[PDB]
């Protein structure tokens, strides 16, 4: 007769952002806060509390140390200072960075689930698998929960619409090999693309809007130094989904045995999340232009782990 | 026919804070931001309109400039850089600001609800209402919205209990005479003061939840260098009150003409808020200590207008 | 400086079902009930302010008349007798029309300047007549249509593929009745198409044609069971005055008037549409195929045919 | 890893808009209806299910049998035929405890290992006896008691002194029922004593007798009016609910078991008590005046006689 119980590790613009949301949301009555630098934790863990009065029900915020993760339901992993203006390097650093992170949260006897948020996020969220031993469905990466609502928004732009009422997806790498469906991108039915296609210049509209998806980031970095309001409503997004056992299909990060002719490789695609995490993948029809697409996005993945 | 708009001006620490608050509440579908600093507006406005497909229903945000304030509802202030480590020189500082931003959103045809958050706060309030012309029921500082939040923040942790179930308050300056009303302060009736004085060095633990209260801001800002969670919060909580027409009782920066035996001067008091602002200032009753503490209060405000 | 009011007409089970949900929910603050039945009515509202303290935000419940509708928002018309087994349909049509007639004067002559939200069966044709009758544009007039169709499709598809319902997009269309049409061809989840998943499976074709009739067939079912049906179009209801109160720009399956899309005029009848607070914003023509069209023409036919007999 | 599952027992027009206010507000993800009336169980289940696809998140709502509550988390009772006009007391009750005992013992032997929540007449009376068939701790049995004559106090309040229910701190505690009594030496807005500001106006001390006339007398006039009441249980059963599986805390009124608390024991009464995901974690004791106190004692030792003559 457990609360709801999350633990975020890294507390810097995006965890902190994270934090804020779930006190908004309400997703979860107990949040614990662990990062290295114990006067930021301190300073938020209060700013945070004073909020809880107000919000919708009960949330208790708390500086937290790895014992605190032994009854943790869900550990949300956003720590690695961003990537400084090469790959490799980050990936070293921020790998040794997770293997100390999991290994302290396995000792503490946590058994729930991991999201990790860190990038290069597929890269991360595979060796948070491989280092939790935890089986795939209580590992997931943000992936492209974040990619898919920048394309929706977007889109909504475009056509005018409530971003709830546009259907699309970011598949792939969360970064320069992701791709859109557009295959699938609708608005009740209306095939976006088509549309598009349709209007003065509409190949040039096309491309924009996904240009303006996959390099949002770089965009937001160039004008305010960091991003962090997208990812951590995405985050409180995939948290929501287990939390209340949705079921809800989310394009997240998700490992790969077989679906999309793909295996060993964490990689963002549509999922169905529920309390128990990621409860299947879900295989949708791709035409030739997004099987390159996503054929050839895996194996950068799997390139980069290799290196 | 139209929508609920709200026009942020000063896209800092706090507002942006607001800015996501509102974007995870959907309080309202339209919100509009101005910043000298355009830069960090066009980022965050790109970052906020990112999380705006999670959001529970649907909200527009974006960058704007003060013709934008013609048909806006309301209009919250947390434009000014906080105080480097004088009061008069803030003041004065801040006032002029001010008179430009306020004078601006009049210009504009603006005939709604201004929500100030600037500090000094009730001075700031005082002076929006002065220079707007507008009714003092349209006229809205966030005074104690947050004092009162950290007061019923640390008594549910002295008393384990939900915050919402924490009846409690603190009225006065948002500063260093607000005053605790100890007189009411109840979970269900039990009478929290009381409850303290019986615990073994309870009067040390009463005066520590009150200074805790008291130098909270000071407390975060020692930690992380600005604080901005708990008065977003309360900020959303207000706009809240207004767009759902609620006629709840909420702790703000009032104009008092009459009540509490005090003219002429905004400070913290419970006031009934509604879609037309402050309905009207709740007068509650109050103990000896408590009544020469407010009065002590709203003489250092009416002071500090005078100088 | 008014807060959100709707006036609900009609306070029988699906009105007193969209008055609790309204309760439940706290779309808007101001909620006025009228009924011919005023002891039903006092009834219903003592019991529903008695839930007011647990809404999410303050909801004000009170009985009213009809000059409570002079500041009204939204006005909801969910008034009129359901059908008895055997009345004819075009008795059904003349009685309704008639205290539509009456209804929506009384509306009018308040100075009310809102949206019309309309449930009563046949709620195309009442949807019409609501627009006709209160001389409104067709923005401002709305009929439920298939709100409630579309759900119960997506809910028989939710089982079917076993993911929430929200995570499944699909659309009934038509008359909110038996000349509805399902649009397999854009039914889906995240892209997957499940008409032609569903073929795939055994007796596919038998399972392709269940859920639709499950759908066409769902009020018959529950009335069977338990004498009316208000939960789904209670729900239904809702969503469209969120839709509204909140300015969405949603895309909602409802009833809505077509001047030349989906080449038919003249008509109320389902259609994706656009809603905010001005109310239908403009209708969606989205591409049908070949069986699709043939459908929803005769569909819209249907309606047609009925208002000409009425 | 499972998630949050709720059986509800009595689907009548208390249960069925129990389960209507869970799917508005999407507490938990999984519903089960449990009633003797299969017929108006299938009908319902159907009608709620086609609401879900508006629900804020999922919500599956079944059909059950007493198997499904092996690992239900809340098992929510409203199972009994209201009290028939001129039926006595303890004939209501002899008839209760039976339909009790029997349904106690079909979830038991599921093997149901969470909290029992309520409302059936007389909500303390089988409470005490749920607790009693059940073997449980106290904490995991919990009766819906004054959670909703404190609703209906803070309602004709709000109205009294024209503010937001939510920001009228009042509450009722006692029997649900004719000895329950007021706590006016606590009733307040923001610190407003409200006893003593309406005593103050004229005729004020009538005002005072009328709001909690009012208040105890809802029921009787809500069932005069429209045959039953079922909103206000529903919606505060609903506010129970939230308060387990958001694991809040809250300080809500509900019947309760005293094992010492204001010097009674033995005895289901309504009183504040902290509710959270183990059900009630312990009963707040609260200053009485004379008055209360003497009310209070009159209300225990009535419900100690009612189950000692049962
Ligand atoms: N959509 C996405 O997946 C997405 C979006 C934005 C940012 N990011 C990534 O999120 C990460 C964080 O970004 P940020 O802007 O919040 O960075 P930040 O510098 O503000 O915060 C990083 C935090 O991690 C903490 N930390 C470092 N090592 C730690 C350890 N061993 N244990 C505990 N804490 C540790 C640091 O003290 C710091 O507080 C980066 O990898 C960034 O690129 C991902
Ligand atoms: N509870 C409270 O009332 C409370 C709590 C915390 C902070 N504050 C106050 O809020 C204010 C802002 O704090 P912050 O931490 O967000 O500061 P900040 O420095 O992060 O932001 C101030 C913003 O105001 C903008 N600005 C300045 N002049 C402007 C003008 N003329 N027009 C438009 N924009 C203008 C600046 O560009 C900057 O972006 C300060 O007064 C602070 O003390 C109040
Ligand atoms: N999805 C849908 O559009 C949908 C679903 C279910 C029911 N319905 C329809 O909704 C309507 C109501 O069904 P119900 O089950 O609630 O019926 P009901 O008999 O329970 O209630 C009808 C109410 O209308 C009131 N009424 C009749 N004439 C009136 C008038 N002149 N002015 C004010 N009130 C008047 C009656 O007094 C009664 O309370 C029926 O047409 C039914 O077929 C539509
Ligand atoms: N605030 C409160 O605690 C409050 C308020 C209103 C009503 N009530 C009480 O709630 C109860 C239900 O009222 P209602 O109006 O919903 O009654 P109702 O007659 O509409 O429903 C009672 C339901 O119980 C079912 N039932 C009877 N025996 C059963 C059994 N052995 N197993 C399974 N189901 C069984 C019946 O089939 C019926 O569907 C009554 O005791 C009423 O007095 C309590």
Redesign the interface.
């Given at each position: 007769?457990?609360?709801?119980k999350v633990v975020l590790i890294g507390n810097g613009a995006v965890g902190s952002?994270y934090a804020?949301?779930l006190?908004?949301?309400?997703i979860v009555?107990?949040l614990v806060i662990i990062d290295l630098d114990t006067?930021?934790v301190?300073?938020?863990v209060?700013?945070?509390?004073?909020?809880?009065?107000?919000?919708?029900?009960?949330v208790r915020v708390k500086a937290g140390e790895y014992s605190d993760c032994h009854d943790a339901d869900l550990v949300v992993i956003c720590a690695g200072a961003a990537q400084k203006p090469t790959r490799l390097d980050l990936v070293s650093k921020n790998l040794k960075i997770f293997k100390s992170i999991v290994g302290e949260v396995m000792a503490s006897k946590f058994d729930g689930?991991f999201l990790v948020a860190t990038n290069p996020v597929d890269i991360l969220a595979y060796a948070t698998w491989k280092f939790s031993g935890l089986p795939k469905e209580r590992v997931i990466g943000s992936g492209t929960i974040?990619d898919?609502?920048?394309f929706?928004?977007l889109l909504?732009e475009a056509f005018?619409?409530?971003?709830?009422?546009?259907?699309a997806?970011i598949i792939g790498e969360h970064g320069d090999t992701e791709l859109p469906?557009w295959?699938?991108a609708?608005?009740?039915?209306?095939?976006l693309k088509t549309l598009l296609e349709q209007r003065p210049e509409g190949k040039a509209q096309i491309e924009q809007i996904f240009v303006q998806t996959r390099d949002?980031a770089y965009?937001?970095?160039?004008?305010?130094?960091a991003?962090?309001?997208?990812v951590?409503?995405?985050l409180?997004?995939i948290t929501?989904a287990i939390f209340?056992?949705?079921?809800?299909?989310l394009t997240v990060s998700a490992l790969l045995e077989g679906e999309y002719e793909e295996e060993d490789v964490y990689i963002g695609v549509?999922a169905?999340i529920?309390?128990?995490?990621i409860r299947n993948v879900?295989e949708?029809?791709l035409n030739d232009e997004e099987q390159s697409k996503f054929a050839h996005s895996a194996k950068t993945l799997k390139d980069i782990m290799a290196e």
């Amino acid at each position: 007769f457990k609360g709801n119980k999350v633990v975020l590790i890294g507390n810097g613009a995006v965890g902190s952002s994270y934090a804020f949301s779930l006190v908004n949301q309400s997703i979860v009555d107990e949040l614990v806060i662990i990062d290295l630098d114990t006067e930021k934790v301190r300073g938020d863990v209060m700013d945070l509390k004073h909020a809880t009065p107000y919000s919708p029900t009960t949330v208790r915020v708390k500086a937290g140390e790895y014992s605190d993760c032994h009854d943790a339901d869900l550990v949300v992993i956003c720590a690695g200072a961003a990537q400084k203006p090469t790959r490799l390097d980050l990936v070293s650093k921020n790998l040794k960075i997770f293997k100390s992170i999991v290994g302290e949260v396995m000792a503490s006897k946590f058994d729930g689930i991991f999201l990790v948020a860190t990038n290069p996020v597929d890269i991360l969220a595979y060796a948070t698998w491989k280092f939790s031993g935890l089986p795939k469905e209580r590992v997931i990466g943000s992936g492209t929960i974040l990619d898919s609502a920048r394309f929706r928004l977007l889109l909504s732009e475009a056509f005018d619409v409530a971003p709830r009422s546009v259907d699309a997806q970011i598949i792939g790498e969360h970064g320069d090999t992701e791709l859109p469906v557009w295959s699938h991108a609708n608005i009740a039915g209306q095939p976006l693309k088509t549309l598009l296609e349709q209007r003065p210049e509409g190949k040039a509209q096309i491309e924009q809007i996904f240009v303006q998806t996959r390099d949002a980031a770089y965009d937001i970095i160039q004008a305010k130094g960091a991003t962090y309001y997208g990812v951590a409503m995405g985050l409180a997004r995939i948290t929501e989904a287990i939390f209340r056992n949705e079921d809800a299909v989310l394009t997240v990060s998700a490992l790969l045995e077989g679906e999309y002719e793909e295996e060993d490789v964490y990689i963002g695609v549509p999922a169905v999340i529920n309390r128990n995490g990621i409860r299947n993948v879900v295989e949708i029809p791709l035409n030739d232009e997004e099987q390159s697409k996503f054929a050839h996005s895996a194996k950068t993945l799997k390139d980069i782990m290799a290196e």
